[PDB]
Amino acid sequence: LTEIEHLVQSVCKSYRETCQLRLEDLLRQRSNIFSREEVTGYQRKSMWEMWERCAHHLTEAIQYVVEFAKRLSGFMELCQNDQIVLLKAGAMEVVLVRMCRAYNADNRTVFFEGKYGGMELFRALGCSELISSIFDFSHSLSALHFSEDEIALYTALVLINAHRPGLQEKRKVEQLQYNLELAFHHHLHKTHRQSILAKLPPKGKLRSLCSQHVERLQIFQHLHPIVVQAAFPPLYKELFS
């Protein structure tokens, strides 16, 4: 078949092997919600304990996105500088997109440590405005009801972005980007789902939310640092250290 139909296939496979939580599991557990008492239990934890828990979960989620990127056709062929630039700009944007699969718009809950809970679970972090923004962004995306294949192709394009500042081989990121844009557009046409294009988040909004998120993470890491066994050291070193 066409290069483009094979690329649709390699991206969707990459996503399925690295999606971290299975959509069917997430959907099934929606009814499994934290009680008043369990919520109070989380709210009473120190900011230090809640940070340790949340940092760990976020680091693990980033590591699935790194593995996703490393399985995208052409990514490993980029110079290591460009692999770092794309993942440093993009990997947390992909996590915030992946969150919509684990988010229930009906009751504004997210799947966290085995059950669904609202943003007030995270009270002890003293991050309410930022956490509210992250929930609202997921609330936005949920209205699309992304298919597994749409989120695979969309999140590939979140990463493979030739406009990221600092790319050494910009022409080669463009070639990859053009093919992934064609794959996504082709797939939406084949599935009668072009309607989602007008509804995708403004790009500026994903960038500024995620930029705020990573700045807060870097402040917490500076105050109370957790240590990570880095899946991709060169990238980590430009984030931890």
Binding status of residue 21 toward ligand HC3 by CB under 6 A: yes
Stretch that binds ligand MJE, among 29-37, 56-64, 112-120, 157-165 (CB under 6 A): 56-64
Closer residue to ligand MJE, CB minimum distance, 198 or 227: 227
Shortest Å distance, C-beta 163 to ligand HC3 = 25
**One residue of 6, 16, 28, 57 binding ligand HC3 per CB under 6 A:** 57
Binding status of residue 228 toward ligand MJE by CB under 6 A: yes
**What's the token pair of residue 55?**
């940092």
**20, 24, 29, 38: which is closest to 116 by C-alpha?**
29
**160, 149, 142: which is closest to 26 by C-alpha?**
142
Chain-centre distance for alpha carbon 50 = 20
Three-state DSSP at 10 gives helix
Binding status of residue 62 toward ligand MJE by CB under 6 A: yes
**One residue of 110, 160, 173, 209 binding ligand HC3 per CB under 6 A:** 110
Stretch that binds ligand HC3, among 40-48, 51-59, 173-181, 192-200 (CB under 6 A): 51-59
Q: For the window 128-147, what string marks contact with ligand HC3 as x by the rule CB under 6 A?
A: --xx--x-------------
> Of ligand HC3, ligand MJE, none, which one sits near residue 104, judging by CB under 5 to 8 A according to partner kind?
none
**Distance, CA of 34 to CA of 164 (rounded, Å):** 40
**One residue of 44, 189, 216, 237 binding ligand HC3 per CB under 6 A:** 216
**Distance, CA of 122 to CA of 128 (rounded, Å):** 8
Could you write out the DSSP letters of every residue in 32-59?
Answer: -B--HHHHHHHHHS-HHHHHHHHHHHHH
CB 136 within 8 A of CB 108: no
Shortest Å distance, C-beta 99 to ligand MJE = 13
Shortest Å distance, C-beta 139 to ligand HC3 = 12
**Distance, CA of 216 to CA of 231 (rounded, Å):** 22
**What's the token pair of residue 170?**
């910009």
Q: Residues for the chain: how many in total?
A: 241
- In the complex, the residues that contact ligand HC3 under the rule CB under 6 A are 20-21, 54, 57-58, 61, 95, 98-99, 102, 110-112, 122, 125, 127, 130-131, 134, 213, 216-217, 220
